[PDB]
Symmetry: D2
Subunit: 363 residues, 4 copies
């Protein structure tokens, strides 16, 4: 084949720097990018109305936590609405995030759509006019983006079509982000749903990630300028066999070593409906696994950083400080777990043990 | 692999019937789907303002031509704006088209976008919310759609990435149309630009169409419910060697026999900046080619049906009838040429001999 | 992409002529290419020793049948040993075949080998030094070759790997034959084993043949110079639902129209353990199917032309003429069935109704 | 997709152990596997007859060098003939190699063959009966194998077909080795021929290696049980621009980080017609490159370990010891260079500075 270089040297240097800053040692990502429909369900649980103001106040509570959180969070993923909101003190949230050391990110996909002729498999849409939105977001403060693809384990799933198509669409979104100075987080999520055992999840994760990195190569994507956000390798939600944290860790780190090139700057796990603590305990075993792990291995957590906070908050403005503390507890814990220095040992208040699992068809 | 049938038997029967009606013997397609920006250039040429009303009047002039045109046109491709306009007598254009025997079609792509890391190659966008637009259009009278992909011949073009990506995106659009009862016209256009000879165009067309039909198979597309709209195989615009019409015909029909399955219902050529007459003369040689041609071989022409009409019209309302006649001449001629019964022999007024070639980068 | 033409015009003309002569109207193929190990089992059934001489005598009995067979057989596929044997009158068998109007063919594969990490799937070997063997065989009288690949229908079979790998290896063998003036018969056999219904066989056949024709395109194979030898689409051996001959015919011809380009010169079905008569009755329905069938649709039968002959022969030299008649009956019948002119109506002696099914693992 | 595990746990453990032992720190590979035709040219250069005995004596001179070589050589690749020869003291060479700490390897490919319809591109043959040869070789003392594929940089080379086909055939050979307890060395050589600059070699190497690791994944190959033998990234032989050793090192290590998973056990470079010293100097810069190199980075050298030895030997039995010393010099140097501890600084006798470049068409 033949080169017509996608990016210049300076564009490459800019992408590699943003990627590296996000997952610097001790740091992970807050995923705060729930659309209106999905944050509505979380506000319902605490009997709070889904208005714009409550969404603004709840995001302000996460983003203005005290400075124990600054070395813990390298990046915060926002939903379009929040990127344009302001804290009570007048500053725009992107400014709030950057003044505490963080990089601002934006969810740019437009959700999943059905693949015809499949057993309920999806691809994800959002490419239309993506270039133009990325250039606006970059001007508005965001340096990284996020696009989620969803695969399912089943008797005949994932299919070759679902794998191919989802890999190809992640590569297209990645190319378009890099052109506009934004680091793409590639997220090929394999759902936990079903009763498969640890080893089926591990084999399917290996096959999906191999298709992903071939697609990214075919689309000329600069890997040092990307991050990956995969599922850990766990057994299925309904699996009756029990696996230990070190088995989850070994499986995960062995699946990643077989597929992800050492040039990828880091890997930022999703939590997948693991509880707050379980999600920290698995991250910490992953980072204690004796194999050579040539990339950062950190967190990009949504529900596993927010659950105790949401429940402490309760929609009451006077619980603000109790709610922030509960998030700061979890941020400290995952900042230790991504270094393999997390000590479960009671400690802290000790964030939720309640599962955050929701089942991911229509739901 | 394993079946979860994309379509039911009745959905299949509906798709095959619409496809077959469009390209019934003697019939072809009027492409009248120029967006606002592209019809502006044609109205400029005749010193006429690009307002909505002039666009409405000019489309009315094509769509209400007398009944010599009824057996000639099986289908008319419209731009979104026109699908909602009305003739002077109060009827909506879809109604005008159907009362004269025609099937209404709608352009649903949103144009081409650059592929990074390539020598100026494009893919085409428009998938976002395509399902929802197709279901509305189907309710509003359209039964078929059109989506154009553009490839270029050059020293290192088309690339494997451009071929793969364009094939995959045509397959996605096709799947989504079939789900909503619309027959997709798949259009993998290979531009005429450049100085390549007939045999390079033929080899590139064979390679592109093979990738297209594999992609459509991987996406489970029902082929009897589709039409193809390819370029004829011609030498490049700047090629100095001269080829005859029978060489153009043989090359074209030999490239199609090697790639397009007999299940495809028909093939509706684009004109590509050939003049009105040349476009008719090539169609008629294609349909006189002695090889076995197991699909309809007809026209889906934009500029090659409209040029003499536009020039006769001149933006003057009193030339209406002179302008219609000029379109009806061309419609009769292509209705004969798709049967291999067209007699060039002076005849008619004899539509333009002027090339309609425009060069297809920014332009 | 870019051309460095695999073949010259004269090489192409030679290949297309041999292909067309083999499947001229009324003609089919005798597959007489059982290796030593497989003809041993057939000679055991008639209590006859598997010596070289009995193998020679039995092949002589097929190849010197009287001239009712001349217009019926366009081609005869031999095993390497037989290509070098002589009839009792001194002539080499290739000479015997050619003097009766036939084209000589040679089996050049070296059997199937296991694909690791699969549920018992195979690929087929034989490429090593294939070029050199083809050039010798061409000098020794053969003009076409045969290479068999085997796929299986099961819960997770065929796999994507089995499909891909078998398609790729057929394309390699085809390229190498064409370079040496030999027409390759491409044989992607999907076994009848298992209890799947007609529609699973049809879907799997469509997916396999699409991968095959894409592979042949990627390897630059001249399609007019090839023949295909696929399975008809039938339900599985152990399927309890019953399908009629016209359902078998429709399924088959609908699967072929969706995948096989009109340039392929012909399609020469295998029998697959159908009895002599059933194999003739299905061929004749296939050729009565009302759809447009743009290629020859004929037979390349092994067991379905030989069973009554073998049993009449019995290893006794005095039954020679009774055995030949029994083969000539079957040759006449398939020559009518490939024209859709076969009349079952008792008639003839009426060749075996006994199934020729053997189950195709180790066996 | 779905698992039917290619290998058991114990087979995996055996493969990973052999792979790891070969490229233990300080160790590299002697490639002594020149076929008869290729060692003939090297014996001609020193006016020595190409008999079996001289081939035996010359291999004995390499394999019985004194024990300074034991910690330097983890593995020795032999040609089939040599695997069955004996040293003068009666021991079989495999025994000689193992008693000095080494692992015995065997070349199992059967050379390259032309790909039709390409600009002189090749694939490589040798799969036929590979399973059976691997099981014999394993019994005869070999634990690893070697199979070389050759790609060329040119105006339209490598083509997509050449890349695909060569990747697929390396994956097939690898699968078959692993089944028989042999560690496959995968060697996708990109020739140095031509006038391309460093950056074209680097881009082509990235594209080839991405296709290779996808193919190995599709064929279920256990990566911990493999080694890679690629070209370093250098400019072309006829390139007029000059590049430094650190540019060669950076390019090489940046191309490998982008494509080769961390599970691959090691990477054993070929020399490619670099002189003895240049080949050591590049290995040592590669291993001083500041980036994270998660696999061993060592040598699998043929001509770059033998040139001064061959020339000192001269076919004279009395120069034996002078010839061995000359090989031991080079072995020490590459054992230091694979640790990034090699000091060019005059030193030693100082092995050839003469280029070992031969041009690799017919030649």
């Amino acid at each position: 084949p033949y080169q017509y270089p996608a990016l210049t040297p300076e564009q490459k240097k800019e992408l590699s720097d943003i990627a590296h800053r996000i997952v610097a040692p001790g740091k992970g990502i807050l995923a705060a990018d729930e659309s209106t429909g999905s944050i509505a369900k979380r506000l319902q649980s605490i009997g709070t109305e889904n208005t714009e103001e409550n969404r603004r106040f709840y995001r302000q509570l996460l983003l203005t936590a005290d400075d124990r959180v600054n070395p813990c969070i390298g990046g915060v993923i926002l939903f379009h609405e929040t990127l344009y909101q302001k804290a009570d003190d007048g500053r725009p949230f992107p400014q709030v995030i950057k003044s505490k050391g963080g990089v601002v990110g934006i969810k740019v996909d437009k959700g999943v759509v059905p693949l015809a002729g499949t057993n309920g498999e999806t691809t994800t849409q959002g490419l239309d006019g993506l270039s133009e939105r990325c250039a606006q977001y970059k001007k508005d403060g965001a340096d990284f983006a996020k696009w989620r693809c969803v695969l399912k384990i089943g008797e005949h799933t994932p299919s070759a079509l679902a794998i191919m198509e989802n890999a190809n669409v992640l590569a297209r979104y990645a190319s378009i982000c890099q052109q506009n100075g934004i680091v793409p987080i590639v997220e090929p999520e394999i759902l936990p749903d079903g009763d498969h055992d640890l080893k089926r999840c591990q084999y399917v994760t290996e096959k999906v990630l191999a298709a992903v990195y071939k697609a990214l190569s075919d689309h000329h994507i600069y890997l040092e300028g990307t991050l990956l956000k995969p599922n850990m390798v766990t057994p299925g939600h309904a699996c009756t066999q029990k696996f230990s944290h070190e088995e989850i860790a070994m499986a995960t780190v062995t699946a990643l070593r077989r597929t992800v090139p050492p040039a990828v700057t880091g890997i930022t796990f999703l939590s997948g409906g693991q509880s707050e603590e379980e999600a920290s305990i698995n991250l910490n075993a992953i980072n204690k696994c004796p194999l050579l792990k040539p990339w950062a291995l950190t967190f990009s957590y949504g529900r596993a950083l927010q659950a105790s906070a949401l429940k402490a908050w309760g929609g009451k403005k006077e619980n603000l400080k109790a709610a922030q503390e509960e998030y700061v507890k979890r941020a400290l814990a995952n900042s230790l777990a991504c270094q393999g220095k997390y000590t479960p040992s009671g400690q802290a208040g000790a964030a939720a043990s309640e599962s955050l699992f929701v089942s991911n068809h229509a739901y």
